[PDB]
């Protein structure tokens, strides 16, 4: 459907009211079913309208115009719904032509710390709601961890690079508003082992299947066996995988034992039988002599001597019967033995090469969570899986920076201004910053509310880069401590010519050791110009930051020479290497759910701070210090869209507090 697809594209169930909706519309959700469906239709239709043309503001009047009866019956209901959607940023977000220009009378003053996507998105919204907004940004540019490299026709992203599917993704709206040259990325990704040769197809498929089975098993270990604490410490995904791998090794050995044990049981049956046959053969030998002797007595003979010959004949054929029936039994146990000798179980769980290729998939997981697997929560690392968007992933061929630059249009942004201290009290706030180029130049900004979008890396910094006065409460600082803030880096290689397969966007390189599994493990060919981009993930990321570009570029070229041939790989014209952990305004790449943490910590990161009263016995103050960013959004962590969404959420919470609901 079109109305139901609008709900889907706004991350909403089409046939049901959400918790956020219940709060603003309690009368409707506690009321009769028919009125809920009217609400739901109005909601879904208004979204559809906005989504069909997100380049222009959708007004309440234009919305009401385009509804039919019986939905246009109640016009307060339509107004309530429209305002809710606008306030929460589900419509009229991003960059659109305003119909009635913005009133010049500004209510309230907000300082936003940081002009990445979370800050920019909040700022736009707050301006549109009629607040006075100023953003303080330590860098000489906007965008933050959206950081695009530009030199000549070379354009490559060092931070965010990919739109992770359009189905449900607010960046779909942004792509209709800003020219991002979105290009689909094809899934095909061949692996090349350390020597430079394709992993052969059958092995590739077997290791991958085993990888997913191993992962499925860690999940099983977590949810069914409640294997989440070990030595009074939370179990990490890395540990769990180790344990699972050990148990597969155990079983391979148990299986060999069981097999060789039934070979001995059968050989011992045979031993017993062969002894029985050797004894009977000697019994037969003697008894034959006895019959030979008895029949060499030539006739005529008495009847006892005839009996002797006859009785020994009978006795000798009867024993030859036994021995014939026993050599039957001999023959069948020798068949059973040649069968088991030729049907052995597997010698090993995984070969050396198998474990190397398995490590590549593990590195891919370390890239995804931007951290070593030993840091990931076993129970909760994947806790946001249900909110995955649908569709192909896409490159931003223009350079992702095009997005923050566009979002900065018409906003009061102060660059080269590093916030040093944040003060919040019951009468308001002051933010104290310095000029990054001369740190003596101090600035003081006074406001009703501060929106902190400092990266989790920065918040973690110890000793602190930013001081909060009064200090943040233990509930916030503990959450900051528990959450992970990972690292991930990129090597951009710019050439004069394409020497790789132009129709393949992705290819792996399998490292020789587990320790180096993340090192230049994945390459990307995404851009119009001849650029290759290599990742440094896992444990390699931290370590590679203390190694020079020339060496890192060297190791890249070594790999690529291995795959395409020494004469095919020229020295690149331009190179760049990211060092995100060392960047003082990031202190890492993005968050992950650390062992000991959970999705609930993202909600704690999102909770605003409310100061104590100035004078005792004064009524409860309003909240002053708000938080946004990738680390604040449980369902879309570690992404550009999570950042965007987290900004929209805070603009609404702030507007609700200072302009009233």
């Amino acid at each position: 459907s079109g109305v139901e697809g609008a709900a889907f594209q706004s991350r909403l169930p089409h046939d049901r009211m959400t918790s956020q909706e219940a709060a603003c519309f309690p009368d409707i959700i506690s009321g009769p079913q028919q009125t809920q469906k009217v609400f739901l239709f109005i909601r879904n239709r208004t979204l559809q309208l906005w989504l069909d043309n997100p380049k222009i503001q959708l007004t309440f009047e234009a919305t009401l115009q385009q509804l039919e009866a019986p939905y246009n019956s109640d016009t307060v209901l339509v107004h309530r719904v429209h305002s809710y959607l606008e306030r929460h940023g589900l419509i009229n977000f991003g960059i659109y032509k305003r119909i009635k220009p913005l009133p010049t009378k500004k209510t309230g003053k907000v300082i936003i710390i940081g002009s990445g996507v979370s800050g920019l998105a909040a700022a736009r919204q707050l301006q549109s709601f009629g607040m006075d907004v100023t953003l303080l940004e330590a860098r000489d540019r906007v965008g933050g961890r959206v950081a695009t490299f530009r030199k000549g026709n070379y354009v490559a992203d060092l931070g965010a690079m990919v739109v992770t599917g359009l189905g449900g993704n607010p960046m779909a709206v942004v792509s209709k508003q800003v020219n991002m040259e979105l290009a689909k990325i094809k899934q095909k990704c061949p692996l090349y082992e350390a020597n430079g040769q394709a992993v052969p197809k059958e092995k590739d498929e077997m290791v991958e299947q085993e990888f997913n089975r191993l992962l499925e098993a860690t999940s099983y270990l977590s949810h069914q066996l409640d294997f989440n604490v070990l030595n009074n410490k939370p179990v990490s995904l890395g540990q769990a995988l180790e344990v699972v791998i050990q148990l597969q090794e155990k079983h391979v050995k148990d299986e060999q034992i069981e097999h060789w044990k039934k070979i001995v049981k059968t050989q011992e049956e045979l031993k017993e039988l062969l002894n029985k046959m050797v004894n009977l053969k000697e019994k037969i030998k003697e008894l034959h002599q006895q019959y030979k002797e008895a029949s060499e007595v030539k006739p005529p003979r008495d009847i006892t001597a005839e009996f002797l010959v006859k009785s020994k004949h009978r006795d000798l054929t009867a024993l030859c019967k036994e021995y014939d029936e026993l050599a039957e039994t001999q023959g069948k146990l020798e068949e059973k033995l040649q069968e088991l000798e030729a049907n052995p179980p597997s010698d090993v769980y995984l070969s050396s090469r198998d474990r190397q290729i398995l490590d590549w998939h593990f590195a891919n997981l370390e890239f995804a969570n931007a951290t070593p697997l030993s840091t990931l929560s076993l129970k909760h690392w994947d806790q946001d899986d249900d909110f995955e968007f649908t569709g192909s992933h896409l490159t931003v061929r223009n350079g992702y920076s095009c997005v923050p630059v566009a979002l900065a249009e018409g906003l009061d942004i102060k660059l080269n201004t590093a916030v040093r201290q944040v003060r919040y009290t019951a009468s308001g706030c002051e933010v104290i910053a310095v000029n990054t180029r001369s740190t003596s130049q101090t600035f003081i900004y006074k406001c009703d509310a501060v929106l902190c979008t400092l990266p989790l890396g920065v918040l973690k910094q110890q000793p602190p880069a930013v001081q909060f006065v009064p200090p943040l409460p233990e509930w916030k600082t503990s959450a900051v401590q528990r959450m992970g803030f990972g690292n991930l880096n990129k090597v951009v290689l710019c050439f004069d010519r394409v020497f790789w397969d132009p129709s393949v966007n992705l290819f792996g390189h399998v490292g020789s050791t587990t320790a180096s599994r993340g090192e230049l493990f994945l390459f990307w060919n995404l851009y119009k110009a001849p650029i290759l981009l290599a990742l440094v993930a896992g444990e390699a990321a931290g370590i590679m930051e203390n190694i020079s570009d020339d060496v890192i570029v060297g190791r890249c070229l070594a790999i690529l020479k291995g795959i395409f041939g020494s004469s095919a790989v020229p020295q690149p014209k331009e190179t760049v290497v990211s060092r995100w952990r060392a960047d003082p305004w990031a202190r890492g790449s993005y968050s992950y759910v650390a062992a000991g943490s959970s999705g609930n910590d993202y909600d704690l990161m999102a909770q605003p701070i409310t100061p104590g009263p100035s004078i005792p016995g004064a009524p409860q103050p309003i909240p002053r210090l708000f938080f946004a960013g990738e680390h604040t959004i449980r369902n879309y962590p570690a992404t550009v869209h999570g950042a965007l969404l987290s900004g929209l959420r805070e603009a609404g919470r702030i507007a609700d507090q200072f302009l009233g609901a």
């Binding site: 990919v162 992770t164 990325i185 899934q187 990704c189 991958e208 990888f211 997913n212 089975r213 191993l214 992962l215 499925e216 098993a217 860690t218 999940s219 998939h361 891919n364 997981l365 890239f367 995804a368 969570n369 690392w381 994947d382 806790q383 946001d384 899986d385 249900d386 909110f387 995955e388 968007f389 992933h393 992705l506 792996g508 994945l522 992950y592 759910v593 879309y636 962590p637 570690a638 992404t639």
Partner: peptide
């Protein structure tokens, strides 16, 4: 998180 995977998306443990 897992949602970031473009190449060889892991499936194991995902519903």
């Amino acid at each position: 998180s897992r949602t970031m995977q473009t190449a060889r998306k892991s499936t194991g443990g995902k519903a």
